Design a protein around this nucleic acid. Structure first.
Lengths: 85, 180, 192, 60, 52, 99, 143
RNA sequence: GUUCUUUGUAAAGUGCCUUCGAAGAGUCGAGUUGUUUGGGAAUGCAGCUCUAAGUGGGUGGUAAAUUCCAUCUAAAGCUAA
RNA sequence: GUUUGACCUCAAAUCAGGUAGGAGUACCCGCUGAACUUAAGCAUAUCAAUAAGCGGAGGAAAAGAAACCAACCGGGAUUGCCUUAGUAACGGCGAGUGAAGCGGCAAAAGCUCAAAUUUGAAAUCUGGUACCUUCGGUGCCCGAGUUGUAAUUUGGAGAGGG
């Protein structure tokens, strides 16, 4: 079909650059390429520290403010989890 | 005329002669730029039956795109490319020329609506109305309409009048003054 | 030193020169490459001595003729007889190939160098099969000369005044003597 | 004075300059002339000649 | 409107900061900051069953 | 065609006078014609043959029309298309080995 | 029991509430009126044919269809191109396969051409005092 | 309503007989994948691969095929409410 | 004839004349496109062929004069409304999703190109230029154009001949 020795190599490179094979996707490769594609300081928050939306004086990369209503809440949750067991 | 002789010939795309010619033309265009002008068209009959008439304003550009999930066509992709290039021009339609393993080669019939021959000759005065701007990017040429899914019938219900229009039509609650 | 082979040329130049090289070096079907078993020269010169007599009407002569027959139509006469029958080349492709299969063309001239060559690839077979006097010529711009265009790619004769009938007859005999014996083999001569 | 003298100079010819051309809007410097939208092929010309919308009324 | 009260930039300050859990405003500088929004009770907040 | 007067049957429905209309012109669309036959035959002998058609003519000759039918129906889509194509190949082979 | 909502989605945006009703009606009646003052002596509507409908649930009925056929109107003795101006619909992709319907339609056409006066293109254009519905004047009755 | 231009070897329409009658290709279609649909065993679209005809073609989807019968004429285009 | 020259293809110019961008973006045509959430842990699925993102236009856009719907005494382009229906169909047939025709009604408008040879006359057209009654026309001239501009014809048909 496509002869090589007659024809010039400056044509042959850009010919065989792009005169490629015909292959579509197969199913096992479709799912396979899909699989390849798959991949503290607590603070009682009273007095001076309260209402501060930032940090208090007392500094650490973790921090947790508390007021008593959380103590009520977590009391209630301890109750109800006991009743859930 | 030569209309039918040419046409029946170009359907025979795996005769030795046209596949040879295709090989030459691909090498030719591939050394050429991606987008470029042709002054004169390769399938003149095909272009004529898609609405070319050889007079002052009708233009061709010939264009290269990649292959290889893209619910639009390559055809329309090319057409966006040229519409963004020649924005004054207005895209009438397009056609295949040739391909490769790697690329597909296309061609496009365009109009310069400012040109006065076009503004007269009212087979084509319809286009200088402002509406048919950038048709290709709204999908109003024929492949745009295919890919929108616009032909008729109960096969094509989910897109017949615009998918999104009828989606909004049927996924909306209509409520009267006087509830039925 | 002159280094004309070493230069970096421009791009389109490179394209067209490589293209001609490529079309040389490529094996070809027989349908095309009956082109370039094309016509020789002295016959062409005679052919054009003929054809330029039957050159067409230009715009000037057309409006001049029109003014004349506008003069004559009103008072004296016109059945489009104020003017004679004109006789000149038929040159348009669609019209020419329409005239074929009627069929009326005494002679046909086919350019080799037309770029969408598929326009005309059918033609030699057609005039072969219909048995009609075709020949391939060298350069389409010649035809543009003789029918007043940049180029036309085909020239056809269907009508000629009487003085040149035998001249044409010998002409077609010549090209029949160039095609029926030695470019009959345009499909033949596979190498061995 | 200067503007109107130049109107008189460039009077009665096409290709008169940009500030003296009308301003109107972009898409009415486009948005074709009355002639180009009046324009129509000979075919429909004949069609509208021969068979136009006649005027009638239903009593009788 | 569909968007009375919704034209705001809030989210709460959170749990345990000695203050309520209304969603409160970011930023500063103006004196709207720290006020509430996205509520029924709040000033400048959306009503209950936004009438339609 | 003529109906029975009743709800069910071979010609169910109302028994009525027909008209036998004109045919529309738009059914004789696949009509060949002198011109199209001429040109299509011309282009047929001019450009000739594709590779799978070469495979068809040798395979019909050696291993027959059942194999040719199935393999053509595979290279192309469908049954009735393969039918006409192999019939055409028989016409070609008759043409080439008679004349 | 089984009971079905389709309300899972973001429906509140896409709610379209026809308060627009009488305002539209009035706009419409004004459309009718000014169409009349444009088309002054003509009826605001065409003459429409009589067709027996499909789908045996309904096929006893007869309905104001689209368009008189080329065959029918030919036998009435006048063309598509004239009838369309005279006020007559034409649907070309329809075929006549019932002679009863055929003669019905042509009787309707004859009755039309009798019930009209045509102002020519020439001139003086007498006073004609329009009627505003063809289908009321030319009713479409089940036989 | 007005006035001039005006239908002339110009244009168009209508009957009978006769010979015709062209009608869009990397496109339809088929496979396979993806994606989407209410779509069932492919409702649609895209990509890759294959690739047609003209008394043709598409469509009317049964666990399976063949022929029927019906109806429309694709791959090109315009148009207010 | 080692000179001269048609033409092809390709380039340039502060050439003559034009022109596209950007904004707005409620509505509209497209592309790409998730999650929370919902459901059996949840993966299919749902929220969603959505919001966000990108491109594109008008005052309306889009679709549109059947390669339709049907299976009957056949309808008749598109569009929207009511009704079919919360059905047919789909789906761990579970969550849940989810249409269309027929019918009534508002509006109602039909059509063009390729595809025929003008061949006893490229019959066409931009542009420059003068003149003129200038949303333009007449004439003179450069020039595109036969690798086809006009007329005729578009399937309801229609063309040629009498």
């Amino acid at each position: 079909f496509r002869d090589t020795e007659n024809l010039p190599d400056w044509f042959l490179e850009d010919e065989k650059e792009h005169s490629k094979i015909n292959k579509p996707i197969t199913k096992e490769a479709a799912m396979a390429i899909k699989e390849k594609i798959k991949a503290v300081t607590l603070v009682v928050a009273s007095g001076r520290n309260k209402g501060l939306a930032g940090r208090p004086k007392g500094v650490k990369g973790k921090y947790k403010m508390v007021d008593g209503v959380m103590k009520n809440e977590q009391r209630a949750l301890r109750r109800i989890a006991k009743k859930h067991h | 005329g030569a209309y039918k002789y040419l046409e029946e010939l170009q359907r025979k795309k795996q005769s030795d002669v046209l596949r040879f010619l295709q090989r030459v033309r691909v090498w030719e265009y591939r050394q050429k730029n991606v987008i470029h002008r042709a002054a004169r068209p390769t399938r003149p009959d095909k272009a004529r039956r898609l609405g070319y008439k050889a007079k002052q304003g009708f233009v061709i550009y010939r264009v290269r795109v990649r292959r290889g999930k893209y619910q639009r066509s390559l055809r329309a992709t090319a057409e966006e490319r040229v519409g963004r290039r020649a924005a004054n021009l207005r895209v009438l339609n397009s056609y295949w020329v040739n391909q490769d393993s790697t690329y597909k080669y296309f061609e496009v019939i365009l109009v310069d609506p400012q040109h006065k021959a076009i503004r007269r000759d009212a087979r084509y005065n319809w286009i200088c109305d402002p509406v048919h701007k950038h048709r290709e990017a709204r999908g109003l040429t024929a492949t745009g309409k295919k890919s929108r899914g616009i032909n008729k019938g109960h096969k094509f219900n989910n897109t017949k009048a615009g998918r999104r229009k009828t989606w909004k039509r049927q996924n909306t609650l209509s409520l009267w003054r006087y509830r039925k | 030193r002159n280094l004309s082979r070493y230069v970096k040329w421009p791009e389109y130049v490179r394209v067209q020169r490589q293209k001609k090289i490529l079309s040389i070096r490529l094996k070809v079907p027989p349908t095309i490459a009956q082109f370039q078993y094309t016509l020789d020269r002295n016959t062409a010169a005679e052919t054009f001595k003929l054809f330029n007599k039957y050159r067409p009407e230009t715009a000037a002569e057309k409006k001049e003729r029109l003014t004349k027959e506008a003069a004559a139509v009103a008072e004296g006469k016109s059945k489009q007889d104020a003017s004679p029958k004109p006789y000149a080349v038929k040159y348009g492709l669609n019209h020419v190939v329409a005239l074929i299969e009627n069929k009326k063309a005494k002679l046909v001239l086919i350019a080799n160098d037309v770029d969408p060559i598929e326009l005309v690839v059918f033609l030699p077979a057609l005039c072969k099969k219909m048995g009609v006097p075709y020949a391939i010529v060298k350069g389409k711009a010649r035809l543009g000369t003789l029918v007043n265009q940049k180029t036309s790619a085909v020239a056809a004769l269907t009508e000629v005044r009487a003085e040149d009938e035998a001249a044409l007859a010998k002409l077609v005999s010549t090209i029949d003597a160039n095609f029926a014996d030695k470019y009959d083999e345009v499909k033949k001569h596979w190498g061995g | 004075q200067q503007r109107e003298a130049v109107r008189q100079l460039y009077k009665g010819k096409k290709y008169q300059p940009k500030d003296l051309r009308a301003k109107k809007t972009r898409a009415l410097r486009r948005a074709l002339t009355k002639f180009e939208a009046s324009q129509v092929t000979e075919k429909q010309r004949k069609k509208q000649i021969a068979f136009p919308q006649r005027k009638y009324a239903i009593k009788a | 409107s569909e968007k009375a009260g919704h034209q705001t930039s809030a989210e709460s300050w959170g749990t345990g900061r000695a203050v309520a859990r209304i969603p409160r405003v970011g930023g500063g500088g103006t004196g709207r900051s720290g006020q509430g929004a996205f509520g029924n009770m709040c000033r400048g907040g959306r009503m209950f069953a936004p009438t339609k | 065609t003529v109906k029975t007067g009743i709800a069910i049957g071979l010609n169910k429905g109302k028994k009525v006078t027909s008209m036998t209309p004109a045919p529309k012109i738009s059914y004789k669309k696949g009509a060949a014609s002198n011109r199209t036959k001429f040109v299509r035959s011309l282009v047929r002998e001019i450009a000739g043959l594709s590779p799978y058609e070469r495979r068809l003519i040798d395979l019909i000759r050696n291993s027959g029309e059942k194999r040719a039918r199935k393999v053509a129906k595979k290279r192309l889509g469908s049954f009735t298309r393969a039918k006409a194509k192999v019939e055409e190949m028989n016409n070609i082979i008759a043409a080439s080995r008679r004349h | 029991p089984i009971l079905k909502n389709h309300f899972r989605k973001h429906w509140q945006e896409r709610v379209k509430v026809h308060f627009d009703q009488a305002g539209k009606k009035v706009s419409r009646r004004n459309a009718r009126a000014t169409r009349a003052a444009k088309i002054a002596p003509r009826p605001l509507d065409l003459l429409r044919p009589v067709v027996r409908a499909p789908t045996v649930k309904y096929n006893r009925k007869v309905r104001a269809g689209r368009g008189f056929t080329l065959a029918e109107v030919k036998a009435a003795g006048l063309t598509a191109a004239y009838a369309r101006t005279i006020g007559i619909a034409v649907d070309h992709r329809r075929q006549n396969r019932n002679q009863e319907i055929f003669d019905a339609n042509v009787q309707r056409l004859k009755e039309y051409q009798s019930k009209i006066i045509v102002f020519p293109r020439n001139g003086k254009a007498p006073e004609a005092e329009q009627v505003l519905s063809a289908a009321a004047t030319f009713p479409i009755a089940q036989p």
